[model samples]
Target: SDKIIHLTDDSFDTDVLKADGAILVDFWAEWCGPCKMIAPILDEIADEYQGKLTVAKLNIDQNPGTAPKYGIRGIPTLLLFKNGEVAATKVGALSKGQLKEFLDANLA
Candidate 1:
């Protein structure tokens, strides 16, 4: 089951920034091969972390404003937001274990 939420510029604030718990916002594009490769791993993280975290995907091609605001210059960039602020950022594709470790270290 895919638990990843597709995000748009309109919903970004309410869903990710103002959200109560920790959230991981993945900035990607349709044409990016690496972005497609890491999609499933992100879904797994979404399901595995269910209540503890919110996993969302933002298409940089469509949502241009947020990407530049965050200084995201690459595809498949993940921004971990907690308490309405960015706690950590990771760029590029990563294995499930690596992703989990990042979440584990930042969740608390």
Candidate 2:
């Protein structure tokens, strides 16, 4: 099983952008309440979709360039990247069902 990864500014591109297949990146910070709420949900899916998807979290507080470059205006934003480019975006906390729905809508 896989676990959600914590990435920094320096490793963001190499781990997320240039990686194979798809990666769901959570742009969040320590102070974000919503980010904490959705953390477990992301953790579950990280294992569920282990080989199919790679789920990562980038702290907006620590990683400045990665978040700003992606136009992340708020914390807890989920950006689904396909082959190094953003294909879908979801903001705020999401339930398990809604998370699957989002993945279904964009992971195709």
Candidate 3:
């Protein structure tokens, strides 16, 4: 089954930047309520799109290196990475259906 993987600065490059297929990286912070709100939605997205993509969570508070490199200035930012590059990005909270649309559009 698909599940959200926790990413750290050390494992970021290997797991996300260099990973195969489409990877959704959520740059979030625990203190942000919006981030908490979208957590479950992202999980559902992970399961629904299992085998087609990977969902990862990176706490900007704990892991600082990757966020700056990606120019992430907001919480709950969703970045779609493909072929070791960013394919699409979204900021703020979104419904599951909206997220599915995002994935469908980008992953297609």
Candidate 4:
């Protein structure tokens, strides 16, 4: 699904920043409870919004550089990128509807 891809700092440039459409990036870690809470929701979003946007998961433990660069001090952070730029960010867990609303409201 275009909704979810495993991305890293090494691949962030090519996979997310240079991506063609809107990108929703979930910055998470395996040990984080809140991050796990949002996984299924993210998977559902990936299924629901298939082709219109890109949804991805970035493992913070694996790629430390990008997370800190984006000031990610917490788990389950959601970063939206459009036109190769940072558009919006959320630093906690969110329900499916809230996520949809966030995307719908921000996407051009």
Cα lDDT of model 3 overall? 0.88
Better of 2 and 4 by TM-score: 4
Residue pair clashes in candidate 1: none
How much lDDT does each candidate structure score?
A: 0.89, 0.86, 0.88, 0.88
**CA displacement after TM-score superposition, residue 89 of candidate 1 (Å):** 0.5
Steric clashes per prediction: 0, 0, 0, 0
Candidate 2 residues lying further than 4 Å off, grouped into runs, are none
Q: What is the Å distance of residue 8 in model 2 from its true position?
A: 1.2
Q: What TM-score, over all chains together, does every model reach? A: 0.94, 0.93, 0.95, 0.94
- lDDT by residue (9-57, candidate 2, tens digit) is 8998789889899999988888889888888898889888889988988
Q: Between candidates 2 and 4, which one is better according to lDDT?
A: 4
Decoy 2 TM-score against native: 0.93
- Give lDDT: candidate 2, residue 8: 91
- Model 3 per-residue lDDT at 84: 91
Off by over 4 Å in 4: 1-3
For 7-81, candidate 4 gives per-residue lDDT tens digits of: 988999999989999999998888999989989988888888888878998898888899888877888899999
